[PDB]
Ligand binder design. Structure first.
Ligand SMILES: CC(C)(C)OC(=O)N1CCC2(CC1)C[C@@H]2CNC(=O)N1Cc2ccncc2C1
Ligand SMILES: CC(C)(C)OC(=O)N1CCC2(CC1)C[C@@H]2CNC(=O)N1Cc2ccncc2C1
Lengths: 470, 470
């Protein structure tokens, strides 16, 4: 059993004794604080609301367990038993909290309010920041979705330049990250975030998360194809790599198949094994079932270029209408080693310079896609901006002398469209003046109930690229 | 409800069709591959074995669900229903797998076998690498434990040099990482890995994980103390920072209390508020209840040094027997911003150069400790080294021409003590020659049962620093 009373930073257990006396309201907000990643995809809050925050989340037993744990953990009795019992007795253990959020999938520039949190009962002023820790973990799906989207921009730019269109863009960056993340839960969350932008994944955990918490009209939100790993090649023995390749492409003769080719010598594999010995098994394949050759080692750019050079001399290459070289439709390449947002850019630019179409290549990314990301990439942060004490509201904030970048916003916040159609966050309750049209934040959680939800289809629509919007 | 049939990389669903015909055995191993991190702490496999791998992990319902999901995911019927049904019918859904591993908490040089996996039924040759994905996630607790231990070495060195002993070392690096990790599950796993080396944590999730899967003689494996956050200071209003400080130290007058002091001006807070206005409330405190001043912004080293210099002029400083400056026992500092293994080193060395004892300071680390780590840091990797096909065992491996660092080991593996008492991994079944004594790996999992396990107390003992043992 998950216990929300045990799902906070230890020090937050002690904060109910630290706020000003006679405080009836604590109001806090989340932003991806300003100073590359100029705009962020808001995604993942709905998962947290449903899995952890909604319904009866307080019980007699959970309160007693927290009491027992904290007694030993602090070697002291500090723990707001009275405060938690109040929620249990008054609200049947539902959290007296209201959360307002920008719609999921929305693409918002840095430094804007993305969601706000406040208590709905004066007794529970302490609860707003109790749940900071769990809500701030939304940094992860936001960051995966954003970084995945930025890679989609790079791919779109180069695919368009080298081919004249964006056909198949949504399968150009595949999630290989299941083994390389920190947990099963992280795998599902991160994979789901990547699927906001693409349709290809091997991180199966993402599928069930989307089905349970978001939903799609299609049976599944992500797809894959058969592929070898080094074990299915090397098991045949060093002298039998050709036998492995032949067996595998024949087993998967009528679907696309990726075959890792660098077990011993990627260049030999391309030029002699695929390019000569087994060439007859390749050139006979359907356009709907290409062989996808997979290098997996060496300098990513150098290796991709050398593989393409080798294949271009063993297979019939055409020149497309943009002037770029194109392998025959039954043959493609996938680079799935060392791919991150930086190396992706390097590879596609290198290909373009050597006159190879991005049509020729797909990418897989594991650690770079799902694990090599932190909360400080987008400066995802939760801060109190407004309190009511003795019936008077005051606008509060931090502003550390040595770091203006950590200054936080003041007062009650709202998010608005500007006259030019951009975004602006209004501070100090100025949204109440109604000079800027409707607040784009919507109540998504109130008093233990999820009040507004988005489908995965809606999220995908909101997160589209401008070029996709033609 | 976790389903092991949906907890693998998609392509592994297709591998049972790719191995050589009549393969009865696939044998694989995990290492932290050689190229500072020269030695790794082996920790976390026991969690995976118990939570995910043991007992009846296959049911009719789980098979049908996987079948239904993969049909859509692959747009084809590639799923091995028969193979999974065999496990259900023959072994009541228990995995016919044997896993041997080095004891948890063991500190082992890079490039050694840490665990091995093989099928115990010839029909389940495909099962060995099915579970690669889930087992490889052990990289995370291994890496957190290892990186946390490397930071303990730094702290030990400087604490010993500046004070003459290691008293309180186990509380010098505190886990602040709960909000900065990618999920609740990751938080618990990561926190538990840090607790292999230290006793201080705010990531409460780590406590219940340890209790459930490992166990300690003590009631809890980790501890904390009351502390403020920016919201409990700023809520008082910008003109009332002093009132906030006074309220908090008075509420927590007889236990240690950390109070964040950089909301507006860290240097003013130290020199004028703590150092003058509230000095009388500080010098009266017990040595068991110090005020711990917490800066949280600016250059970490520069800020710590300036804070110490300020405090040194407002409070009575002594010189310890090693010649280093020491704040009075009722006053300490905690630096919890921007701390990672690199900045930790820079701060303690800078303090040493300015003649400040490491006794004066403790560290908190969040993102650096639990999130800013990837599988490539220690090159944690799972590879097939031995197969049996047509009754003949063959030693198998990869050895990519362009990257000798990715070469894998050959044949049946074992771990041994050398004549000088170091570790060596024997390949090609050479352990059977008995020239190197007994295999140090133990069977930890066999046919659905955990066969050997370790308490958290034993893991801690195994992971001790030499300087602690000495
Ligand atoms: C056919 C079409 C053009 C629509 O799509 C593609 O051509 N793609 C290129 C090939 C593709 C699908 C997209 C990526 C997957 C093949 N999988 C693969 O190579 N894997 C899986 C995996 C998981 C973890 N680690 C290592 C690997 C190696
Ligand atoms: C008294 C003794 C000498 C034994 O130990 C210390 O002096 N310590 C320094 C103070 C200590 C305990 C060890 C760390 C905790 C105070 N907690 C704290 O500042 N937090 C918690 C937190 C969690 C997430 N993010 C930000 C923070 C800010």
């Amino acid at each position: 059993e998950f216990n929300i009373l045990l799902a906070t930073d230890s020090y937050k257990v002690t904060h109910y004794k630290q706020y000003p006396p006679n405080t009836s309201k604590v109001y806090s907000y989340f932003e991806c604080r300003e100073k590359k990643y100029e705009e962020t995809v808001f995604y993942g809050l709905q998962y947290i609301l449903n899995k952890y925050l909604k319904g009866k989340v307080v019980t007699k037993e959970k309160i007693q367990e927290a009491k027992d744990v904290y007694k030993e953990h602090f070697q002291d009795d500090v723990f707001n038993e009275k405060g938690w019992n109040y929620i249990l007795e008054k609200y049947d253990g539902h959290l007296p909290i209201e959360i307002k959020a920008v719609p999921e999938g929305f693409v918002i520039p840095r430094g804007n309010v993305l969601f706000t949190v406040e208590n709905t009962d004066p007794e529970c002023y302490w609860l707003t920041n109790w749940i900071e820790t769990i809500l701030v973990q939304s940094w992860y799906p936001i960051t995966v979705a954003t970084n995945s989207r930025e890679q989609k921009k790079i791919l779109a730019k180069y695919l368009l330049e080298t081919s004249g269109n964006l056909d198949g863009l949504e399968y150009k960056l595949h999630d290989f990250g299941y083994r390389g993340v920190s947990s099963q839960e992280t795998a599902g969350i991160g994979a789901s975030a990547h699927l906001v932008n693409f349709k290809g994944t091997d991180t199966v955990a993402g599928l069930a998360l989307i089905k349970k918490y978001y939903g799609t009209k299609d049976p599944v939100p992500g797809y894959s194809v058969p592929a070898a790993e080094h074990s299915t090649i090397t098991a045949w023995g060093k002298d039998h790599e050709k036998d492995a390749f032949e067996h595998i492409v024949t087993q998967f003769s009528s679907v696309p198949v990726s075959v890792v080719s660098d077990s011993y010598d990627i260049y030999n594999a391309c030029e002699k094994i695929w390019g000569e010995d087994l060439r007859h098994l390749i050139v006979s394949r359907s356009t709907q079932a290409p062989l996808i050759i997979r290098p997996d080692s060496g300098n990513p750019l150098d290796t991709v270029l050398k593989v393409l050079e080798i294949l271009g001399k063993k297979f019939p290459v055409t020149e497309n209408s943009k002037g770029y070289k194109l392998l025959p439709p039954y043959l493609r390449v996938i680079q799935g080693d060392g791919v991150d947002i930086n190396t992706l850019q390097e590879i596609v630019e290198g290909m373009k310079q050597k006159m190879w179409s991005i049509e020729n290549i797909a990418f897989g990314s594991g650690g770079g896609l799902l694990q090599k990301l932190t909360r400080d990439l987008l400066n995802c942060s939760f801060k109190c901006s407004y309190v009511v004490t003795n019936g008077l509201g005051i606008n509060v904030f931090k502003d550390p002398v040595a770091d203006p970048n950590k200054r936080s916003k003041k007062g009650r916040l709202s998010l608005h469209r500007t006259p030019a159609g951009n975004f602006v966050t209004l501070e100090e309750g100025k949204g109440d003046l109604e000079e800027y049209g409707q607040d784009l934040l919507h109540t998504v959680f109130k008093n233990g109930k999820v009040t507004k939800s988005y489908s995965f289809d809606e999220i995908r629509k909101n997160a589209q690229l401008n070029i996709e919007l033609e």
